[PDB]
Structures are given as structure tokens and as C-alpha cells.
């Protein structure tokens, strides 16, 4: 146990701030809302962009999934859920399916492309606690993290857990998939993040030193780093190879924790939603707050950066989405 | 939008919006309640009499008023995370088995945790105390000293007088926690037998009082 910490301390040749102290910082990045997506009844708990960078599905606590046309503000789909409380939603990389999960211990997979409307294609059951995050690997398998301190790789065609990932002591709140889609990370309320190998089905690395429960996680676009956000009003950036944290994004002014963390296409911008009604944009290499996305009347709950990186969508508890660009 | 296909997409979106408007009309005219308790309590009996899954939702209508009641099922002991989902509910019906004499302290700790929750401020709690008849034969039959578990029972004053004394001792022990803190939310104790049909009526009355007091505070008339 202490050997790993000693090795991590030894491997820390220098802080990333010193290396990136001489670089030219980016200026005040001003982003204005170009579209407002409204129609949700209750607070919005999750959203996910499409790979086409135009469609996005959002989940509301009223028991509703909405698939929007972000370019034209049109509502492509409105799926009524069987359970009112949903805390996560995912959009398939091919766009043929959408997933959701919530207080019920069920992952609902809906088939968008039907000869019929939208029908629930699968109801994955087997988790003991509430689902907090679900992400599609492809049209056949999905990784879902739940409230019983476990993650699970499922087989949608079969409906049974192909693999289970255990080791977290607190319930898992969010997960993110690597661009290679061969391994992922999961942040739990155990104040730690764990790296899971999808094929091996076992934990590979553990990242600690993040004071409160981790509320959000995302990969750096390179895939060798990932940023976490928790409830102690700080964001961490861990590097997979160094097996430690690189920099810390926090301010003395910020008191409330982070709900969602996302990266830009090039990784130069880290967008973090906060409980203080708005989102902060940070220079990911210098930890300087360059840009604030204000305009939400309630706590921000979900963020998303498109694959092409042109726009960033923010959903919060005022039942409104905003497309900043 | 100028194109024909885009116009048809816009009209489909408008139909979606009309459906969402009807759903909002239904959603505003209903009251959401969170049912909490323990395995030893009679929450399942209460929901059955009134009307690996992680939640069970119950619809009950009284005086043409609709009440959703959400009871979390298979969930871990820690609840500090999903409770954030219930910061906009009308009330929290907390059910306690009064005849256990052993899990009573656990129920008190749970009620203290719920009452002082940061996200549950301005959310009122309705205390249901089941097993009142079971409490009655337990008190009258002896062999289970109430003062043994709670040393302050002997130095306390208000069917048989002993049953009423025990009932009101439990009620006061529950309400001391609510009166210790809070002005934004209130506790509504009740006594419920094994099978009673007045649970929905008293839930309706407590919800009416809760919303009335919230409106009075909103306009500053309290």
C-alpha cells in the first residue's frame, strides 16, 4: 500500500505548472448561448451528445427523455420513461439506441430505429443500487455504474452481465469511456477513481487524494489522462501513465462542488459545471479560469462537448438546456 | 425551416411540445411524496392498505387530488446522494414501528438524519407510528420494560393509561428532534394501527397544512 504511494511520489519529477509556466495563456474566452432547448418539466439530470454532433438526448426527473435537433431546436423524440426518477442517459455511437437509468435498478435501452415510434429494446436488471451512469461501447454492450458500489458490462442481446467490476467502497456516481473504448474510469463516493479494463474485467489503477465524493469524470482526448470533479469545489487531472494527479483546478471564491466535467476537442479547455448556477472554463494546462458560462437559473447538472467540438451544451435544474458557442 | 422536410420536422416538434404541455398540466396537478422507514416498519402494509427493483411508485387520489408516493426498495444504507432527487417533494412520510423496542433508537437516528439533511430543508415530515395495537399488547402484557431501553421513560408524564403514556413518550421523543432545529419545515406526528383507512385522509390534511404554511411564508403572513 505505502509502496505504491512512495513510487508515485518518486515518479513526480516536477509539477506540470512549472513546465507550463512559460507557455502563452489563452485569453478571456467569451461564449454566448446560441440556442435554448426548453420543454422539460422537472430538473434535468443528464444529457449526451450524438456522434453526429447534432442530436442530443436529455433526461429529466419528470420521467422523460428528449432527443433534440440542436441545430434547429426541434424536438426529434420524446420518450416517456417507466420510472419517474432518472439520473443518467446515454446516446449510442451509431445513434440506433438510447439508454437511461435511475432510482430503479434497471438500465432501459430504447431502439430509436424501428419499423414501427420508440420502444424499449432491453431492460437490463441485476444491479442492487440505483444507476448513476451508463455509456455505450457499441450497439451490443454497455457499461453501467450503479449505487451498489459496482460497475457492469452487459450484453444487450442476452441481457445478462457479461462482466462485473467491484472494488469501490462508495457508490459510483459517474464513468467515462476512453476514445479507444478498451478501458474506462469510474468515480465513486469513496473519494477515489478506478481504472477498469473492459476485456480483463479487473481494476488496473486507483487514483486518490480527492477530498470529497467524485461527482463527475471525463477522459482527456488523448486518452492518457482524465479529469474528475467532486463536491469539494475542486477538479483534478490524473495521468494514467504517471499514476498521480497533474494539476488542481480550484479557486478561493468557489465553495460549492462540481456536478459535471468535460473537455474540449484539443483538451485545452476544461468545462466544469458548478452548483453556483453556472459553469467555469479553465485552461487545462495552466489552471486559470478563462471564461464563465452564466445564464442558468439553477444548479448546473450536465455538460457535453460535441465530437467536432463546435458547441458545448449545458443542462441544469431549471429544466433548460443552453448551447454555448 | 424553409424546406418542406424541415417544415414537417417543425410540426412534429410542435406536436411533441403539445404532448409535453399536456404532461405538464398533469404534472402540476399532483403532489409527490417520499415514503421512508425500515424493514421492521409497516411501510409495505401501509402502501398495500392504501392501494431487485429499486423504487415502487403508488398513485392514490383523495378529494380529487392526486398523490404520487415513492418508496425506495433495494438500496444501500447510505442515502446522502439520491435524497437530492427529493428536494422538491411535498412531504416525507416517515414510518416507524413502535413495538420493536430495539430498532427505536435506529429509527430516531434515521429521523434525525432526515430532518437535518441539507437538501431536505423546507420539506416537511409526516410521522406515522405503526404497530399501535401491537404496542398495546406489548405494554399491557409486561415482560418488556420500556424504561430499560430509555432511562428517561420513568421520569416522564403524559385504553390503559400505560399504553397512552408509552405512545406519547415515543411521540415526544420523536418531536424533540424536530423542535431542536428548523421554521421552514414542520413535523406531523400520527398514530396508525396495523390496518387503518384514515392514512390517506391524514396525509391529505397534512399536505394541505404544509402547502398552506408554505404559501403563507412565501407571501410573509406567518
Amino acid at each position, epitope marked *: 500500500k505505502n509502496q505504491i504511494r512512495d513510487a508515485r511520489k518518486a515518479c513526480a519529477d516536477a509539477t506540470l505548472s512549472q513546465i507550463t509556466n512559460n507557455i502563452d495563456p489563452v485569453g478571456r474566452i467569451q461564449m454566448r448561448t446560441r440556442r435554448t432547448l426548453r420543454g422539460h418539466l422537472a430538473k434535468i439530470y443528464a444529457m449526451h451528445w450524438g456522434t453526429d454532433s*447534432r442530436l442530443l438526448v436529455s433526461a429529466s426527473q419528470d420521467g422523460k427523455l428528449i432527443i433534440w*435537433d440542436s441545430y434547429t431546436t426541434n424536438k*426529434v423524440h420524446a420518450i416517456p420513461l417507466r420510472s419517474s426518477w432518472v439520473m443518467t442517459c446515454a446516446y449510442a455511437p451509431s445513434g440506433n439506441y438510447v439508454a437511461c437509468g435511475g432510482l430503479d435498478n434497471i438500465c432501459s435501452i430504447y431502439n430509436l430505429k424501428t419499423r414501427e415510434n420508440v420502444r424499449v429494446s432491453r431492460e437490463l436488471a441485476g444491479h442492487t443500487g440505483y444507476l448513476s451512469c451508463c455509456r455505450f461501447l457499441d450497439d451490443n454492450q454497455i457499461v453501467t455504474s450503479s449505487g451498489d458500489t459496482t460497475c457492469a458490462l452487459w450484453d444487450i442481446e442476452t441481457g445478462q452481465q457479461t462482466t462485473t467490476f467491484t472494488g469501490h467502497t462508495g457508490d459510483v456516481m459517474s464513468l467515462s469511456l476512453a476514445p479507444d473504448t478498451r478501458l474506462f474510469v469510474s468515480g465513486a463516493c469513496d473519494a477515489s477513481a478506478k481504472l477498469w479494463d473492459v476485456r480483463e474485467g479487473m481494476c488496473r489503477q486507483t487514483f486518490t487524494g480527492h477530498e470529497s465524493d467524485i461527482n463527475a469524470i471525463c477522459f482527456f482526448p488523448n486518452g492518457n489522462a482524465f479529469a474528475t470533479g467532486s463536491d469539494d469545489a475542486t477538479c483534478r487531472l490524473f495521468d494514467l501513465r504517471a499514476d498521480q494527479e497533474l494539476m488542481t483546478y480550484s479557486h478561493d471564491n468557489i465553495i460549492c462542488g462540481i456536478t459535471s466535467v468535460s473537455f474540449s476537442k484539443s483538451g485545452r479547455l476544461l468545462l466544469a459545471g458548478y452548483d453556483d448556477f453556472n459553469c467555469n472554463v479553465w485552461d487545462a494546462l495552466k489552471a486559470d479560469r478563462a471564461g464563465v458560462l452564466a445564464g442558468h437559473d439553477n444548479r448546473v447538472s450536465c455538460l457535453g462537448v460535441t465530437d467536432d467540438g463546435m458547441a458545448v451544451a449545458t443542462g441544469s435544474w431549471d429544466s433548460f438546456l443552453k448551447i454555448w458557442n | 425551416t424553409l424546406s418542406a*422536410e424541415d*417544415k*414537417a420536422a417543425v410540426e412534429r416538434s410542435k406536436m411533441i411540445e403539445k404532448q409535453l404541455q399536456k404532461d405538464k398540466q398533469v404534472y402540476r396537478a399532483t403532489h409527490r411524496l417520499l415514503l421512508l422507514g425500515a424493514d421492521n416498519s409497516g411501510k409495505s402494509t401501509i402502501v398495500k392498505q392504501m392501494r431487485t427493483s429499486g423504487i415502487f411508485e403508488t398513485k392514490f387520489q383523495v378529494d380529487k387530488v392526486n398523490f404520487h408516493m415513492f418508496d425506495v426498495g433495494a438500496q444501500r444504507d447510505e442515502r446522502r446522494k439520491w435524497i437530492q432527487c427529493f428536494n422538491d417533494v411535498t412531504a416525507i412520510i416517515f414510518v416507524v414501528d413502535s413495538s420493536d423496542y430495539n430498532r427505536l433508537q435506529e429509527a430516531l437516528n434515521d429521523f434525525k438524519s432526515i430532518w437535518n439533511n441539507r437538501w431536505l430543508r423546507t420539506i416537511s415530515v409526516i410521522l406515522f407510528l405503526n404497530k399501535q395495537d401491537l404496542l398495546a399488547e406489548k405494554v399491557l402484557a409486561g415482560k418488556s420494560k420500556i424504561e430499560d431501553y430509555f432511562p428517561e421513560f420513568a421520569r416522564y408524564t403524559t385504553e390503559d393509561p400505560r399504553v397512552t403514556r408509552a405512545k406519547y413518550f415515543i411521540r415526544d421523543e420523536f418531536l424533540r428532534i424536530s423542535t431542536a432545529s428548523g421554521g421552514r419545515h414542520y413535523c406531523y406526528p400520527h398514530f396508525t394501527c396495523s390496518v387503518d383507512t384514515e392514512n390517506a385522509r391524514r396525509i391529505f390534511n397534512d399536505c394541505r397544512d404544509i402547502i398552506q404554511r408554505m404559501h403563507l411564508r412565501q407571501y410573509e403572513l406567518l
Partner: single-chain antibody
Amino acid sequence: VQLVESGGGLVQPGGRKLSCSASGFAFSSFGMHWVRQAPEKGLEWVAYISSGSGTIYYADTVKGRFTISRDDPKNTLFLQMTSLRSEDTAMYYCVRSIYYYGSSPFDFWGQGTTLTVADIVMTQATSSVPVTPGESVSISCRSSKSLLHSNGNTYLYWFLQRPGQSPQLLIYRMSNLASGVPDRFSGSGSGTAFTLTISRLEAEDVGVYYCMQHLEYPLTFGAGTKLEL
């Protein structure tokens, strides 16, 4: 999914109602079309009714002569014919459609029922291409104006009608195959000139090929090329 039609027959000039009953899909969520096909001509768009009946569009030739309606609870579509003329003696097809981002309109067609008594123009230069199985086949078409809109989508649809049965959608917007069509059909264009090519050639590919523009609702189908064996 199924859309089966009823009605039609022999009528004196100047006089029916055609019904289209659906079974196998959410009829209320799909817009509906009535499309004609004369024995001596090709396909001809007749009428369109939206999902919620909010917008209804009619053929330029017949506007007050025909009326269209639907009932979702019965999942049925009605076309009432008034003042039937000699030209209104074509086959009538009840075509399913749906319009959202990424949808595939005109995907399913009914079998149809026999009946006997400023818009843009698209002409297919060839009437019939003689080819042999196993060889790539090219079918060309043209439009009176640039068919590509400002959205970047070109609203052109390619249908194949195999002899003895109803047409079935092949291509929509020149870059999207239909649901179950073989992966040997493809489309290309530049706004005015349009071309569908088949790399292989099978026995089932024989039929009549039609091109339609959906940029504007008065729908200009094409002449159609007969793919003779």
C-alpha cells in the same frame, strides 16, 4: 408493417372513397401520402396529410376534386373522390412517411387498389437501359432547378417498382440506403444532375426506377426507366 387499401373499381365519369388500413406501426406518428400511377404513365403524387393533420397538401391538378382525412384510433386513412374525370383512372398507393432529422420518408408503400373510370419538373432522359446481369448500371435524372437546399440536404428520392407489385424505397437524399435494400445501390449528384448506380446486377433488381423531388410538396416524380434484362 402493413398498409392494405380497399375501394376502387369501375365508375361512371363525374362520380368513391378509398381506405388505407394500417397494421404494424404507430399510424398516428407517420404522415401519409396518396400517390397515383397510371398504366400509361409513371408515379404521380396526389395528396399528403401530416401526422397531426395540421398541414395538408394536394396535387396541383386536383385540389378541390379530392379530399383527404385520417382517424388515428381506427388507424385508417381516407381519400374521398369527387367529380372523377377520365384522367383519374390510375392505381392508388397509400405511402407511409415520417419527417424528423435522419428519417427515411416514403419508406413503406401499400399494395394499392385498381380504379377505372409553377412546380418543378424532373425528366429522366433515358426511358430504358439495356444491360446484362453482373454489370454496373447507371440511371440518370435531371431537375429544373438546384435541388440542394441551404441545409446541405438534397431532397431527391429513388424508388424501385418491381413488376407485379408496389414500389419500394431505395435511396433518400442520394447518400442514404433504405432499411432492407441490398448494399449495391448508390446515388450521387451535384444539385441538377443526378445518378443512381448499381455495382452488381441481380434478377430481383429488374423493374422500373423512379426519381422524386421532395424540395417542394407538389411532388414532381420522374418518367422512370425500365431496367430490361
